[PDB]
């Protein structure tokens, strides 16, 4: 059993070295303009944001459904999101992992940037978590296991993720997870300093305006596990300022139904001292993978998507897991906007 885990571990090292080779290849010469707007029939708007929208579209020739993320170049520039948006596309077209969203096509026109991903009708974990209330520990563990492997993958490429929350996680038709957003993802060796993320999920060292490293992702995993299993996040308040106070305080109250194993994991993930936080110690991610809360997890079977999911959203093209938005035209100027800012896209 130990030599099978050792062989497992060596398989993982070998896999990651290969994945990095292939990542760096796509990363150094990214794809561009792999489709055009007219190839798609727009169906419905699935989301809106400060500098763009997401729309359900259907490829006319293939009939496959896609989520099309449309970003207004001029607003990206005004809101100082150029680097994040360039980073999102470049990372997504370069990464390759079972629990990431699949970027199929990207292109730009005079006005907008387009990223075209395989459509996941199940929607975001957020809506399901809020409706069901909370997930049981086995259920939460299923999702958490996929985030652990995803972070082992991203971190091996020197990518800090920085955007973990139920809002950015989809539940696909097999009940498995797809991580959506990479605007805040950044290739870094060592520390970085940008104040970014979501208040409930921010590690203390982010709030304290000191540098931080990939340990913030393991902290965020702790927040995610806690929120999935309890039904509410470990640090909440009416205003972000009040949330930050609680985060830095170092005090977490656990629900009475949390198992001893879960609480012990969370104390080590929600460790205010980053130098003592699981995933940032000498044994790296293995301290998490070998923790008793994950004793029953078959990491190989999770990676290969062989475990039966505890929840499969009701299979109905369907739009019901997304809200309704006022449909507006996609505007394309007769003049090229912000051409210099987005040459690499």
């Amino acid at each position: 059993a130990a030599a099978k885990k050792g062989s497992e571990q060596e398989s993982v090292k070998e896999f990651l070295a290969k994945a990095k080779e292939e990542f760096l290849k796509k990363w150094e010469s990214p794809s561009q303009n792999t489709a055009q707007l007219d190839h798609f029939d727009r169906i419905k708007t699935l989301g809106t944001g400060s500098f763009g929208r997401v729309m359900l579209v259907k490829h006319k020739e293939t009939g496959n459904h896609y989520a099309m993320k449309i970003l207004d170049k001029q607003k990206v520039v005004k809101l100082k999101q150029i680097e994040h948006t360039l980073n999102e596309k470049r990372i997504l077209q370069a990464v390759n992992f079972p629990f990431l969203v699949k970027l199929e096509f990207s292109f730009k026109d005079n006005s907008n940037l387009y990223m075209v991903m395989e459509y996941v009708p199940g929607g975001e974990m957020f809506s399901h978590l809020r409706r069901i209330g909370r997930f049981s520990e086995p259920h939460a563990r299923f999702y958490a296991a996929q985030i652990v492997l995803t972070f082992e993958y991203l971190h091996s490429l020197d990518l800090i993720y920085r955007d973990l929350k139920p809002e950015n996680l989809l539940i696909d038709q097999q009940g498995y997870i797809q991580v959506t957003d990479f605007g805040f993802a950044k290739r870094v060796k060592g520390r970085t300093w940008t104040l970014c993320g979501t208040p409930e999920y921010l590690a203390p060292e982010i709030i304290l305006s000191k540098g931080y490293n990939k340990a913030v992702d393991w902290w965020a995993l702790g927040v995610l596990i806690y929120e999935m299993a309890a039904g509410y996040p470990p640090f909440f308040a009416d205003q972000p300022i009040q949330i930050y106070e609680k985060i830095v305080s170092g005090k977490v109250r656990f629900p009475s139904h949390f198992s001893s194993d879960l609480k012990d994991l969370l104390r080590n993930l929600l460790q205010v001292d980053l130098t003592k936080r699981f995933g940032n110690l000498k044994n790296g991610v293995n301290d998490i993978k070998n923790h008793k809360w994950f004793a029953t997890t078959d990491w190989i079977a999770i990676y290969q998507r062989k475990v039966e999911a505890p929840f499969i959203p009701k299979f109905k093209g369907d739009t019901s897991n997304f809200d309704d938005y006022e449909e507006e035209e996609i505007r394309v100027s007769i003049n090229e906007k912000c051409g210099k800012e987005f040459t690499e896209f």
Binding site: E167, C196, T198
Partner: peptide
């Protein structure tokens, strides 16, 4: 309960990045 305080907290919808 804590969950009730959260359900009444006003930060129960999708959360924006800072």
């Amino acid at each position: 309960t804590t969950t009730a305080d959260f359900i009444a907290s006003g930060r129960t919808g999708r959360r924006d990045a800072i």
